[PDB]
Amino acid sequence: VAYWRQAGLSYIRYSQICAKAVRDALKTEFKANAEKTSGSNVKIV
Amino acid sequence: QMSFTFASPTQVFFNGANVRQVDVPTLTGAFGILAAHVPTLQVLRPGLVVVHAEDGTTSKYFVSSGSIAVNADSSVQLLAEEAVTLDMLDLGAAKANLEKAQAELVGTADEATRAEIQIRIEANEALVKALE
Amino acid sequence: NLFASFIAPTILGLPAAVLIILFPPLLIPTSKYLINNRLITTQQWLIKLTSKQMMTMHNTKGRTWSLMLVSLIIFIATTNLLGLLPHSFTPTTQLSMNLAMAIPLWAGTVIMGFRSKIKNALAHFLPQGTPTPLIPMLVIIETISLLIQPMALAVRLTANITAGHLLMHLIGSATLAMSTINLPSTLIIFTILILLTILEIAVALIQAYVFTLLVSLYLHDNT
Amino acid sequence: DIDTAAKFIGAGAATVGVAGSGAGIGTVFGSLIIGYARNPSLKQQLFSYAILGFALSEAMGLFCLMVAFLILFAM
Amino acid sequence: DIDTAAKFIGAGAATVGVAGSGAGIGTVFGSLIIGYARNPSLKQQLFSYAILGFALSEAMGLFCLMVAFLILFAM
Amino acid sequence: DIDTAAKFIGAGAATVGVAGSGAGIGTVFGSLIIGYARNPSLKQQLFSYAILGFALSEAMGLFCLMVAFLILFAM
Amino acid sequence: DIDTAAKFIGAGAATVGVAGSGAGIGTVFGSLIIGYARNPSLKQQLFSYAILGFALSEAMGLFCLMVAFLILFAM
Amino acid sequence: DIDTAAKFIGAGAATVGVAGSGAGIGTVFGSLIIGYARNPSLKQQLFSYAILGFALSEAMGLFCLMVAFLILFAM
Amino acid sequence: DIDTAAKFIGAGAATVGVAGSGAGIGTVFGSLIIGYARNPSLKQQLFSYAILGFALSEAMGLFCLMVAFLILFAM
Amino acid sequence: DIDTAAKFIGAGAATVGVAGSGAGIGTVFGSLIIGYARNPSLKQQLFSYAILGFALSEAMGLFCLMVAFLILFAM
Amino acid sequence: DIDTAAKFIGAGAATVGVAGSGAGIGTVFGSLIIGYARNPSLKQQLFSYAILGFALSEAMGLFCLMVAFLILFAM
Amino acid sequence: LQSIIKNIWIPMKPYYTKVYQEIWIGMGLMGFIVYKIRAAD
Amino acid sequence: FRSVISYKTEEKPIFSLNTVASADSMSIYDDIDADVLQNYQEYNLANIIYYSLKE
């Protein structure tokens, strides 16, 4: 039981933050195309 | 004997390939997988992933999160959410963002938000450590 | 007879031990220069490495001792290492000296933990989740443990460096008595002596890092 | 004298009881390495448990050095 | 006397039985570190099991200090 | 007497066999902590196995206190 | 007599060999708890292995109580 | 006689070396339980390793019962 | 003679040092079972490490049987 | 003399207490291997814990060599 | 002579301290098997830790063979 | 009294007056311990 | 999606934690507790939603 689980997170969230920070550390040659292919546009109703 | 499968939401690095060994950064500590390995299933944390082809050559990637599943028929399925080769990353942005998150951690006060800071902290620390 | 290498050496009636203890510092030259020779280059690097490995865990109050601890590990490691030289007198094999290194530093630490911190200091005498029926027995435990910390410090150094030197000396004597007998066995015992010397080199450095790390951990416990 | 002689064997034997703490302390600081490698975020809470285990372990070890010196000198 | 002398060896020997609790206590508070690193939410229930194990372990250890003092003084 | 004297050393030595149960009991209630941290839903079935192991372990420990008292008093 | 006296020390010493089974039995029924917490569906097959280990362990323990009584009475 | 007497202490002491196999056998058949609970499909290959470990362990245990009887009877 | 008698106790005592290899060998071939159940494809490389551990362990065990026979016959 | 003789047995017995550190040190540097194989990124922090455990373990081991030499020479 | 006789028992007893390294070495090269089965890519770094543990373990073992020969010949 | 308290007392005064205060208190506790040791000897 | 002309309405299951944990055939899996099955189930809830969205 990791710490963020005690905090109340979920592996969907842990994975978003992690996949995000790995996208920022990308060099700018790849940072744009990799933020496009992995962005979110859905909206809850 | 091992049929590997390393993929990402948009890229298939391997598919049924016959490799000899695979190193993965599981949330319960790393471990390397060979043929006939005991069946297991785990979820990953930020870290390297090294693949040893039968010819003794080693490919290195970097996965951010995902899931691993070694199976009874020696078939591995490694599905990473964001898989990048090592050379697509830079050390400066890694160290820079590590400081900003460390700065926000000492500044934060709420439990949940602090965990998200820490999650991004360990995200970067594994970045700088894996890079160089 | 056997413990001749541990008797306080005297030259021409003068206490030559005062020279041997003053010597190890003579192997650490210093320079106002910004880029300097190979010896001070590596040494300046190690002292940085050690200080980073020891002082990192400390708060702002603890890191004030960073001169003493790095100077303590550099002196013990150099004395132990020099001691492995033939016919040398290793002043860390002496219980006197090692007591005079462990008694002050352990005492200096617990005192600064008792001047301030006195309510946390007395509270460290009881772990947090300790149950009620087990409270009274667990306080007489630690006060005896705390009292043998300096004794453990000096003895762990003198008894480990003495036993190491005596052992090398015994096996060495065996090779001598074996010189006039079967030659391959002499080679085997000599090979044992070689591997033992390597262990004594690893123990010399570890015992220095151990003595210092334990003084450090005492310091962190009271800062 | 047979009493002064037996005090050496009795004090020597009771010291063997320290071998129990030499092994018990190795297990505590061995499990701290394993336990910390799995959940390194609990480092401060794990170490708190190691010292408690180290103290209680060495406690039984000094009870032997107690009798070892209770026989050698106090008798 | 041969009786006063043998009491020192007998009381010294029975103290070696404390070495069993020095090792048994190290295993309990070693497994508590490992067991708590895996499921830290059970901290209060795990510790309850450590004290029970610590008590039962040291119980066999004091039975030796029992005989060690039953021979040295009570005989 | 040499017999009354040797009874103290013999009863003292046989008590060292209790050190085996001091360590064996620590392993049982150490593995119960590890085993329960994994599958806490089996708490009642695991504990059932600990008591069985605790009993069988201490059984060998009391066989030593048996001989320790069989020599000291029954002979 | 020096023979009747030495029989007490010799039979007392050989009993310390039971301490090995006190610890070996604790490991078996300790690993049964850990092994059963992981795969509780093998409960019947695991227990079969515990008894085999318990028997073979205590076997070496009774070989000591063998000599302990072979010396005390059969000689 | 001092020789017939010392043979009892010497044969009694060498039997304590069996305590090493009482513990070593418990570890083998303890790790077999853990190792089989993880990969029960290797049951036949694991057991093959347990017997090899059991034999080599008890081998050192009988070398002690060797000397224990080499002293008691063969001398 | 007191020398011929003490040689039996001294050779008997030094044999207890074999108990260390009885336990050390059980751990090696116990960890081989656990280590092979996890990565059975390394069977040949693991076994290579077991024999190395078995040899180095039993090495310390025969150093005791060395002294046990160095005292019993060579002196 | 019976005193000069008993000093050899007493100093010899107290040395057996070093066997506890031979085993405790093996557990520390054994758990360092296991703990480092799981989280190799903590190598520097794990090793820091091994040395602390190695020192505290061998500490109890030298307390025995203390008494072993306190009896052999200082008395 | 009582001195030449006691030297055999004292040197025989101090050899039992080697049993600690027989067990400590088995744990190191046992954990190397387990630790290498989990992360075989660290084989060279793990083995580096095994030799360090093997050396430090056997170090305490030779300190006993030190006293064993310090008493038998050097005294 | 020149270049001595200039090279020895100035650089260590930050240490000999506030850092090592508890060390000297311990060093006396040591001298008292070795004195009581060499007295009963 | 089967071809430019042919598609078929398929359907895939979604298992809760208690289904995967209490399965008899999940005993052969290793280092599994009710925490690694929670993270794995959650990530396979986003893996089957994404797979659907691409089909």
UniProtKB/Swiss-Prot annotation, chain A:
Localisation? Mitochondrion; Mitochondrion inner membrane
Which residues are annotated with the PTM N6-acetyllysine? 20, 31, 36, 43
What are the GO MF terms of this UniProt record?
hydrolase activity; proton-transporting ATP synthase activity, rotational mechanism
Q: Which residues carry this modification: N6-succinyllysine?
A: 20, 31, 36
What Pfam families does this protein map onto? ATP-synt_Eps (PF04627)
Domain of life, per lineage: Eukaryota
Coiled-coil portions:
none
Q: Which GO terms describe its biological process?
A: proton motive force-driven ATP synthesis; proton motive force-driven mitochondrial ATP synthesis
Q: Which GO terms describe its cellular component?
A: mitochondrial inner membrane; mitochondrial matrix; mitochondrion; proton-transporting ATP synthase complex
UniProt key word Signal: no
- Report the principal subcellular site: mitochondrion
Tell me which Gene3D superfamilies the record gives. ATP synthase, F1 complex, epsilon subunit superfamily, mitochondrial (1.10.1620.20)
UniProt keywords, alphabetically:
Acetylation, ATP synthesis, CF(1), Disease variant, Hydrogen ion transport, Hydrolase, Ion transport, Membrane, Mitochondrion, Mitochondrion inner membrane, Primary mitochondrial disease, Transport
| Tissue spec | Ubiquitous.
The record's comment on protein family reads: Belongs to the eukaryotic ATPase epsilon family.
Q: Which PANTHER family match?
A: ATP SYNTHASE EPSILON CHAIN, MITOCHONDRIAL, ATP SYNTHASE SUBUNIT EPSILON, MITOCHONDRIAL
- Linked pathology: Mitochondrial complex V deficiency, nuclear type 3: A mitochondrial disorder with heterogeneous clinical manifestations including dysmorphic features, psychomotor retardation, hypotonia, growth retardation, cardiomyopathy, enlarged liver, hypoplastic kidneys and elevated lactate levels in urine, plasma and cerebrospinal fluid.
Protein name per UniProt: ATP synthase F(1) complex subunit epsilon, mitochondrial
From Swiss-Prot, chain B:
Q: Hey, what's the signal peptide range on this chain?
A: none
Q: Which GO terms describe its biological process?
A: aerobic respiration; mitochondrial proton-transporting ATP synthase complex assembly; proton motive force-driven ATP synthesis; proton motive force-driven mitochondrial ATP synthesis; response to copper ion
Q: Where in the cell is it found?
A: Mitochondrion; Mitochondrion inner membrane
Q: Name one GO cellular component term.
A: mitochondrial inner membrane
> Mind listing the GO molecular function terms for this protein?
proton-transporting ATP synthase activity, rotational mechanism; structural molecule activity
Q: Which residues carry this modification: N6-succinyllysine?
A: 100, 129
Chain positions found as N6-acetyllysine: 100, 129
Tell me where on the tree of life, at the top rank, the source sits: Eukaryota
Q: Which UniProt keywords apply?
A: Acetylation, ATP synthesis, CF(1), Disease variant, Hydrogen ion transport, Ion transport, Membrane, Mitochondrion, Mitochondrion inner membrane, Primary mitochondrial disease, Transit peptide, Transport
Assembly with partners or alone: Component of the ATP synthase complex composed at least of ATP5F1A/subunit alpha, ATP5F1B/subunit beta, ATP5MC1/subunit c (homooctomer), MT-ATP6/subunit a, MT-ATP8/subunit 8, ATP5ME/subunit e, ATP5MF/subunit f, ATP5MG/subunit g, ATP5MK/subunit k, ATP5MJ/subunit j, ATP5F1C/subunit gamma, ATP5F1D/subunit delta, ATP5F1E/subunit epsilon, ATP5PF/subunit F6, ATP5PB/subunit b, ATP5PD/subunit d, ATP5PO/subunit OSCP.
Could you say which protein family the record assigns here? Answer: Belongs to the ATPase epsilon chain family.
Q: What is this protein called?
A: ATP synthase F(1) complex subunit delta, mitochondrial
- The organism is Homo sapiens
Swiss-Prot record, chain C:
One Pfam family it belongs to = ATP-synt_A
The entry assigns this protein to a family as follows: Belongs to the ATPase A chain family.
Q: How does it assemble?
A: Component of the ATP synthase complex composed at least of ATP5F1A/subunit alpha, ATP5F1B/subunit beta, ATP5MC1/subunit c (homooctomer), MT-ATP6/subunit a, MT-ATP8/subunit 8, ATP5ME/subunit e, ATP5MF/subunit f, ATP5MG/subunit g, ATP5MK/subunit k, ATP5MJ/subunit j, ATP5F1C/subunit gamma, ATP5F1D/subunit delta, ATP5F1E/subunit epsilon, ATP5PF/subunit F6, ATP5PB/subunit b, ATP5PD/subunit d, ATP5PO/subunit OSCP.
User: Its function?
Assistant: Subunit a, of the mitochondrial membrane ATP synthase complex (F(1)F(0) ATP synthase or Complex V) that produces ATP from ADP in the presence of a proton gradient across the membrane which is generated by electron transport complexes of the respiratory chain. ATP synthase complex consist of a soluble F(1) head domain - the catalytic core - and a membrane F(1) domain - the membrane proton channel. These two domains are linked by a central stalk rotating inside the F(1) region and a stationary peripheral stalk.
Taxonomy of origin reads: Eukaryota, Metazoa, Chordata, Craniata, Vertebrata
Mainly localized where? mitochondrion
Q: What is this protein identified as?
A: ATP synthase F(0) complex subunit a
Gene name, per UniProt, is MT-ATP6
Locate the transmembrane regions by residue number.
3-23, 65-85, 94-114, 135-155, 161-181, 186-206
Swiss-Prot record, chain L:
Q: Where in the cell is the protein located? A: Mitochondrion membrane
Question: Topology in the membrane?
Answer: Single-pass membrane protein
Q: Quick one: where is this thing mainly located? A: mitochondrion
Q: Which domain of life is it from?
A: Eukaryota
GO BP, one annotated term = proton motive force-driven ATP synthesis
Membrane-crossing segments per the record: 21-38
Organism, as annotated = Homo sapiens (Human)
Q: Assembly and interactions?
A: Component of the ATP synthase complex composed at least of ATP5F1A/subunit alpha, ATP5F1B/subunit beta, ATP5MC1/subunit c (homooctomer), MT-ATP6/subunit a, MT-ATP8/subunit 8, ATP5ME/subunit e, ATP5MF/subunit f, ATP5MG/subunit g, ATP5MK/subunit k, ATP5MJ/subunit j, ATP5F1C/subunit gamma, ATP5F1D/subunit delta, ATP5F1E/subunit epsilon, ATP5PF/subunit F6, ATP5PB/subunit b, ATP5PD/subunit d, ATP5PO/subunit OSCP.
Q: State the family named in the UniProt similarity comment for this chain.
A: Belongs to the small mitochondrial proteolipid family.
The job of this chain, per UniProt, is described as: Subunit j, of the mitochondrial membrane ATP synthase complex (F(1)F(0) ATP synthase or Complex V) that produces ATP from ADP in the presence of a proton gradient across the membrane which is generated by electron transport complexes of the respiratory chain. ATP synthase complex consist of a soluble F(1) head domain - the catalytic core - and a membrane F(1) domain - the membrane proton channel. These two domains are linked by a central stalk rotating inside the F(1) region and a stationary peripheral stalk.
Task: Please give the range of the full-length protein represented by this chain.
Answer: 2 to 42 of 58
Cellular component terms per the entry's GO annotation: fibrillar center; mitochondrial inner membrane; mitochondrion; proton-transporting ATP synthase complex
Cystine pairings recorded for this chain? none
